[PDB]
């Protein structure tokens, strides 16, 4: 019954409107929900030389890749969650659902 | 026998064991986060993976 959604994304606004649309689904069917708990962003970082050889002034690319992570805790029946999680998801988002 | 010799020498560690999954090169290897892609190769495919330049 204490069922835990773990939303993880690259893109914010895509994951922000999904976690909002899942918390809609918790209020539309009127079951208690701990809000969208913001887990810290993970900035993956590759700092590589720009030059394919070593024959320029020592410049460096600094690539990032942000991984935003939200979690939603519900007190829900399992089938209501497997119904809501199907509805309106987009490629930027990655959804887990832990039972217990 | 040659079948024993041909590939006898161990390839379990060192930059002669691992190579680029694109380039097939024994140099400029980015191992971090299980990329295993050459420093030229990843500089071409950074955008396509999701590695934006910002700071």
């Amino acid at each position: 019954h204490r069922i835990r959604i773990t939303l993880t994304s690259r893109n914010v606004k895509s994951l922000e409107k999904v976690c909002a649309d899942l918390i809609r689904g918790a209020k539309e069917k009127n079951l208690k929900v701990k809000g969208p708990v913001r887990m810290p962003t993970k900035t993956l970082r590759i700092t590589t030389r720009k030059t394919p050889c070593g024959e320029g002034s020592k410049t460096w690319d600094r690539f990032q890749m942000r991984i935003h992570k939200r979690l939603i805790d519900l007190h829900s029946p399992s089938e209501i969650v497997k119904q809501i999680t199907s509805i309106s998801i987009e490629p930027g988002v990655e959804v887990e659902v832990t039972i217990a | 026998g040659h079948q024993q010799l041909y590939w006898s020498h161990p390839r379990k560690f060192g930059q002669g064991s691992r190579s680029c999954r694109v380039c097939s090169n024994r140099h400029g290897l980015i191992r971090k986060y299980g990329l295993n892609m050459c420093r030229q190769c990843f500089r071409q495919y950074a955008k396509d993976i999701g590695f934006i330049k910002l700071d």
């Binding site: 993880t8 690259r10 993970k42 993956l44 890749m65 991984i67 992570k69 990655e94 | 999954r21 986060y33 299980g34 990329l35 892609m37 495919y45 396509d48 993976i49 999701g50 590695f51």
Partner: peptide, 19 residues
């Protein structure tokens, strides 16, 4: 996964697939 892949590795491997 059965060997249970890391989240940071997952989003890298997902990008490498697309590539």
């Amino acid at each position: 996964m059965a060997v249970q892949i890391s989240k940071k590795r997952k989003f890298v491997a997902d990008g490498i697939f697309k590539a």
